Amino acid sequence: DIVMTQTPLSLPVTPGEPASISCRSSKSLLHSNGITYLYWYLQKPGQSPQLLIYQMSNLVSGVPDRFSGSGSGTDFTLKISRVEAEDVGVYYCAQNLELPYTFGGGTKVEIKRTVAAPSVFIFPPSDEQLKSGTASVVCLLNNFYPREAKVQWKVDNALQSGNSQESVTEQDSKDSTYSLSSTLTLSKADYEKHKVYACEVTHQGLSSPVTKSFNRGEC
Amino acid sequence: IYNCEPANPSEKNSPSTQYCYSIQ
Amino acid sequence: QVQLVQSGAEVKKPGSSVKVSCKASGYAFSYSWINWVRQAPGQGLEWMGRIFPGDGDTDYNGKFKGRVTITADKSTSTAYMELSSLRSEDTAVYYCARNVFDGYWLVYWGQGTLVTVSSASTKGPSVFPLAPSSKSTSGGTAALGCLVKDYFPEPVTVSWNSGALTSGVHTFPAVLQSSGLYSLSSVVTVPSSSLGTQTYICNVNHKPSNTKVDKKVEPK
Ligand SMILES: [Cl-]
DSSP states (O other): OOOOOEEHHHHHOOOOOOOOOOOEEOOOOOOSSSSSSSEEEOOOOSOOEEEEEETEEEEOOTSOOHHHHHOOOEEEEEEEOOOOOOGGGGEEEEEEESSSSOOOEEEEEEEEEOOOOOEEEEEEOOOOHHHEEEEEEOOOOOOOOEEEOEEEEETTTEEOSSSEEEEEOOOOTTTTEEEEEEEEEEEEHHHTTTOHHHHHEETTTSSSEEEEEEEBBBB | OOSSSSGGGGGOOOOOHHHHHHTT | EEEEEEHHHHHEOOOOOOOOEEEEEEGGGSSSSSEEEOOOOOOOOOOEEEEETTEEEEOTTSOOOOOOEEETTTTTTTTEEESOOOEEEEEEEEEEEEEETTTEEEEEOHHHHOEEEEOOOBBBEEEEEOOOOSSSSETTTEEEEEEEEEEBBBOOEEEEEGGTBTTTTTOOOEEETTTSSEEEEEEEEEGGTTTTOOOHHHHHHEGGGGGEEEEEEEOO
């Protein structure tokens, strides 16, 4: 099969500035007829894929003229002359020269903005949940950038691995930040076995890791 | 001989291919 | 107006076979290839196969070892993709797309059908408060929320004060727990100074189980 490969995996773009993404094929997509059978699709957040560029360099009518495509038989570039906020999403290159049709792994385009430290909050388990026999403790990292962040749970100052799960929002369409939740889950019994519950947050916007903690039962 | 064959799989059964054959 | 309308999200048990529909309108159903492409998490787009409804001709991606069957019903202009012996890694959004001849290829796409492969049984969520405290304050605000725990399948919806409260809300993507059930939290940021006089309630709706829950979240 023809393998399609894209770079970079992720691209923070600045509205008003150019952006370029790259693709390559394992075999030339050049036909004797002079056409190159390379296509660019964009899947905007919450939308189905749409075709932007057909046959390497042809813009679908209606697609903004800031988009263009070029390349050789094996290496391709999608260029945005001047990025607009509405250009975010996952871009895929693809070939239809041969069956089976194949697609690149995608390049996820997001908005670059200034670094913003998370606001950190911690939430002990509710009495209601405890009565049900389980304890969920939640750590919230709110409205930060960039997305990369490290959250470590400490209980009685012991690092706990394996008993937490993270969830992260997609980039906010208005302020270009992310938020993240980390939830540590313990049995009600194991939970009562300890006292100090702490969330240690490391992020580029923080001069030093921040810790939010609470004492089990006492506030 | 003029080639009416589809250039690639996504033109199999295309109107252009059918028409091409029709006037050979 | 060309339209491709697919069937709704489907939960399937491992080993079963799913049938996804793609109803076409606004063009000649018989004379364009309908392609099926899936998008699994951590994967890009993957081609499954195609059908030319006029003569029923098909092509399949060999990778799916004969597990895919694509058909068409001319009486309703509907194309179908069936995938048998489902495994967890078949969990994906499945799209149909119409090939437009003369070089354009996949111009028209359906809205996609999420197929989730799981052995889990339908179960309504439990809703717990994420109480505001001296440990959930920043600036002049306080964060609070609701933990919507142990439900299946997706989705759940969460609103605040019956929709009145929309600013400062973050409803996180659900996480699949080791139990096979989902959980998510929804949080909102509000002025800390009025926590004693303002009431905050999350409205949780889980349609698959016909479960509705309203949970008041108060300081603690
Ligand atoms: Cl096709």
